[PDB]
Structures are given as structure tokens and as C-alpha cells.
Amino acid sequence: QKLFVDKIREYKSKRQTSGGPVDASSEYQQELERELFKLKQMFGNADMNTFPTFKFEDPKFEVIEKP
């Protein structure tokens, strides 16, 4: 099995990525920021990593009694 022997080595070269977040990219972040731009802004407009603090309003009310 030449090509199966072949492959195993290449996944190992890949697994050699301790200090490599993206396996020797030297690129592909310039668009990943754009991708992440879309993703974060379309989930929300805040520090999603942190917990949301909740402000709550109360209903209005009027003069209802017989004028």
C-alpha cells in the first residue's frame, strides 16, 4: 500500500502543529478576520465572551378613572 504508507506521514507532518494554530499558513487570517467580522456582528454587537447585564423597563400607565 504505497499511498496509504504515503499518507500517514503527511497527517503526522500536520499533527506537528504544537506551536502552529493553523499549520504554517503565513496567510488565511486576512480573510478570517472578515469571516469573523461577519460572524460576530451578526450574532450581536457586544462583548459576547462576557455575561450580559440586564436592564429592564416597566410599562407605562395613564389616568384610567372616570374623568
Binding site: 504505497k2 504515503d6 499518507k7 503527511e10 497527517y11 507532518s13 500536520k14 494554530p21 493553523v22 499549520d23 504554517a24 499558513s25 488565511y28 478570517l32 469571516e35 469573523l36 460572524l39 460576530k40 450574532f43 450581536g44 459576547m48 465572551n49 455575561f51 450580559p52 440586564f54 429592564f56 416597566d58 410599562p59 400607565f61 384610567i64 372616570k66
Partner: protein, 198 residues
């Protein structure tokens, strides 16, 4: 005090029937007429009633009077009776009209009391609206808090997921890029099996 119905039963408009009844027991039915004849003849025969021009003046007036009562008496009687019937009917209708007016006032008052008894719906409606607004706001608040926490957690999971996806893509294209960076044993074994194809 109610009036009687009939008068006194006069005869010839000049002599009441009490007289004929009063002279019946002693002189029959012809006693009064014999007495009248006798008195008339005695007044004439003895010049107590002097026949003169006043005899014929009186005859003409009495003839006009008898003819008048006989001809225009029914009309005057019915006219008086109809006058009374019209006044009576008008008064009766005014009575019924006042009865109806006061009955209508009583009915109207009972209807107003029914209305004023129905009043409480305005205030229980106001209570309904207050309660409903408070409950809607409570559930909206719980949905807001739920949806925010879930949105943050699923944003985390989605960024991790698509990061894994793009990273695996760069991975795979590296492993292809790496066979370009790199023995006919399999070549011959391939032809060997191709020969066994026959």
C-alpha cells in the same frame, strides 16, 4: 252624585202621568180626559177664555212649537248626548295617557337601575388590562434573558465550529501541497494483476 236616567213621564208636554194614575182608581182611564173636556168647555161657555186675535196668535205659536219639537227634537237630543260622549271619551283617553306616562317612567327607572348594576365591568376591565400588561412584560423579560444567554453561548460554539472548518481546510490543502513536494514496485504489481485480468 250620579244623575237619574229619565225624567218624569209628562203627557203631551203638559200633564204628568202622575195625574192620570192619581185619577185612575176613581174615574177609570177616561176620567182625566172627561175632566179636561169639562174644564175647557166651562172656560169657553162662560167667557173665562175670550176668543180673540190672541186665540189665533197662540194657535200659530203652539203649532210652530209642536212642529219644532217634533221635527228638530231628535237632533238636539242626539247633539247633547254626543257632546257628552265626546267629553267623556276625551277625559278617559287623558286618564289612560297619564297612566301610560307614569308606567313608562317606572320602567325607565328600573332600566336605569339595571344599567347602574352592570357598572362594575369598567373597573374589572381596567384590572384585566393591568394584569395582562404585567404578565406580558414578565414573560418578555424571561425571553430576553434566555435569548441573550443562548445567543452568547451559540456564538461561542459557532466561532469554534467554523474555525475548525477553515483550519481543517487549510490542513487538507497543505497535505495536497505536500505530495507535490514528493519506485515502480506498485507499477509492476499493477501490471501483474492486469495480466491476471485476462
Amino acid at each position: 252624585p250620579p244623575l237619574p236616567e229619565y225624567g218624569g213621564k209628562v203627557r203631551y208636554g203638559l200633564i204628568p202621568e202622575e195625574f192620570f194614575q192619581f185619577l185612575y182608581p176613581k174615574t177609570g182611564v177616561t176620567g182625566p180626559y172627561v175632566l179636561g173636556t169639562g174644564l175647557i168647555l166651562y172656560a169657553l161657555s162662560k167667557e173665562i177664555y175670550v176668543i180673540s186675535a190672541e186665540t189665533f196668535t197662540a194657535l200659530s205659536v203652539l203649532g210652530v212649537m209642536v212642529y219644532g219639537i217634533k221635527k228638530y227634537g231628535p237632533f238636539v237630543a242626539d247633539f247633547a248626548d254626543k257632546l257628552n260622549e265626546q267629553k267623556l271619551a276625551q277625559l278617559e283617553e287623558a286618564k289612560q295617557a297619564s297612566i301610560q306616562h307614569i308606567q313608562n317612567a317606572i320602567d325607565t327607572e328600573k332600566s336605569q337601575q339595571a344599567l347602574v348594576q352592570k357598572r362594575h365591568y369598567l373597573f374589572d376591565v381596567q384590572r384585566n388590562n393591568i394584569a395582562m400588561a404585567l404578565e406580558v412584560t414578565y414573560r418578555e423579560r424571561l425571553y430576553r434573558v434566555y435569548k441573550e444567554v443562548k445567543n452568547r453561548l451559540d456564538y461561542h460554539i459557532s466561532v469554534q465550529n467554523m474555525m475548525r472548518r477553515k483550519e481543517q481546510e487549510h490542513m487538507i490543502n497543505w497535505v495536497e501541497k505536500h505530495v507535490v513536494q514528493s519506485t515502480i514496485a506498485k507499477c509492476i504489481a499493477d501490471l501483474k494483476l492486469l495480466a491476471k485480468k485476462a
